[PDB]
C-alpha cells in the first residue's frame, strides 16, 4: 500500500459485468430438433403415429373390391420436467443513489450489487448449469462430479440415455488409440439408423481425446480416419467434431436428425425472475430465479457412448 493519496491517480474506472450469452447447447442440435413445450413441472405424454403396409398393392383391373390394407400403430412416451429455484441477495432499488457513485456500482467491501447486474450474473451461472445438465444428464457443482442431485425418472441427458449403445475401453488400453478406434467401429456397426441414415452427424469429445485424435494415424490423422468412417455410414454428409470440458474420457456420437433425436424443453427452461421479492427495513433485498430441466427424447440405439476406463 502506498502512503500517499494514490486514489487521486485513479482517473478511470472500468467495470466488467459480461452479458447473458446464448447457451452453448444450441451447437449440439439442429434448428429443427428443438421445439418448445408449455409446462413447468410434472409429466407430458407424446404420441408417435406410425403406418405400415399389410401386403402387396392391388392391381385395378376389371371389377374388384378386395383391396390390400394399410395398418397403423401408436407409441406413448412420457417425459418428466423438473422446476428448480435459486436465491440471490442484491441492493434495494431505493438505496442505489447512496451505494452507487460514478466510479462504483455496488459495495466492493460487501460484494453487494444492483438487481440488474446480479440477475445477469446469476442467469449466466444458471445457463452454464443447464448446459452441463443437458450434456451430461446429471446436476452437480463440483469438479469431481459427486454430490449429484437426485432427479426424476424419465429425465436423461445425452450421456446417460438408456437403451443406447455403450462401449467401454479397458484401463489397460486407456492410451491405445487403435483400441479406442476399434471400439468406435464396433459401436458404429451396432448403430441402427434405418431409413434416416442420410443425416449429418455430431461427435463430442474430451480434451484428452482430442489430443489423442490429432496424433498421426498408425500422412493421415485419427480424426480424419474417424470422419471417413462416420461418412461411410451417414451417406457421406456433414460430420461435426466438438470438444467440451464438461466431459471426461467420454466420446459421444449421434445424428442431428429430428426423426431420431428431439429436444422439447419447457418454454421456461431458461432463467426467469420470480415475482416474490424479500424486503425489510435494511438496504439488502433478495430475489429468486426459476428454471426448468428435462425434455430430451431419443429413439433406441441411435447414440454411441464410449467410456475410457482410467483404472
Amino acid at each position: 500500500m502506498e502512503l500517499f493519496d494514490e486514489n487521486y491517480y485513479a482517473k478511470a474506472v472500468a467495470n466488467i459485468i459480461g452479458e447473458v450469452k446464448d447457451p452453448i447447447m444450441y451447437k449440439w442440435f439442429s434448428p429443427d430438433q428443438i421445439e418448445d413445450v408449455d409446462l413447468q413441472m410434472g409429466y407430458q405424454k407424446t404420441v408417435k403415429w406410425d403406418a405400415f403396409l399389410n401386403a402387396n398393392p392391388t392391381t385395378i383391373a376389371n371389377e374388384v373390391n378386395t383391396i390390400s390394407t394399410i395398418g397403423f400403430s401408436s407409441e406413448v412416451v412420457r417425459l418428466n420436467y423438473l422446476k428448480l429455484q435459486y436465491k440471490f441477495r442484491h441492493l434495494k432499488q431505493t438505496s442505489e443513489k447512496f451505494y452507487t457513485s460514478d466510479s462504483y456500482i455496488g459495495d466492493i467491501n460487501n460484494n453487494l450489487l444492483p438487481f440488474a447486474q446480479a440477475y445477469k450474473l446469476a442467469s449466466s451461472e444458471i445457463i452454464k448449469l443447464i448446459n452441463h445438465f443437458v450434456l451430461t444428464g446429471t446436476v452437480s457443482i463440483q469438479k469431481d462430479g459427486k454430490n449429484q442431485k437426485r432427479l426424476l425418472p424419465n429425465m436423461y441427458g445425452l450421456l446417460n440415455m438408456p437403451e443406447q449403445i455403450k462401449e467401454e475401453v479397458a484401463s489397460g488400453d486407456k492410451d491405445k488409440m487403435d483400441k479406442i478406434f476399434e471400439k468406435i467401429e464396433a459401436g458404429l456397426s451396432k448403430l441402427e439408423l434405418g431409413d434416416e441414415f442420410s443425416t449429418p452427424m455430431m461427435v463430442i469429445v474430451d480434451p484428452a481425446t482430442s489430443l489423442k485424435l490429432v496424433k498421426p494415424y498408425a500422412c493421415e490423422k485419427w480424426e480424419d480416419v474417424l470422419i471417413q468412417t462416420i461418412k461411410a455410414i451417414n451417406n457421406r454428409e456433414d460430420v461435426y467434431i466438438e470438444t467440451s470440458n464438461l466431459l471426461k474420457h467420454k466420446i459421444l456420437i449421434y445424428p442431428l436428425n429430428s426423426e431420431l433425436i428431439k429436444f422439447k424443453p419447457s418454454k421456461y427452461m431458461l432463467p426467469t425472475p420470480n415475482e416474490q421479492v424479500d424486503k425489510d427495513s435494511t438496504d439488502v433485498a433478495h430475489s429468486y430465479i426459476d428454471f426448468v430441466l428435462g425434455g430430451l427424447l431419443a429413439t433406441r440405439k441411435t447414440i454411441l457412448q464410449v467410456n475410457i476406463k482410467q483404472s
Binding site: 446464448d22 444450441y26 451447437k27 434448428p31 428443438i34 418448445d36 456433414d238 461435426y240 418454454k267 421456461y268 431458461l270 426467469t272 425472475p273 415475482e275
Partner: peptide, 28 residues
Amino acid sequence: PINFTEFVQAISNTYKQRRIQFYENLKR
C-alpha cells in the same frame, strides 16, 4: 407489459427469438 405473467411471456418470446437468430447466424 401489464403484469408479471405478460412479462414472463415476453421474456420467453425474447429467448425464443434469440435462439432463432443464433441458429440463423450460425455457420458450421
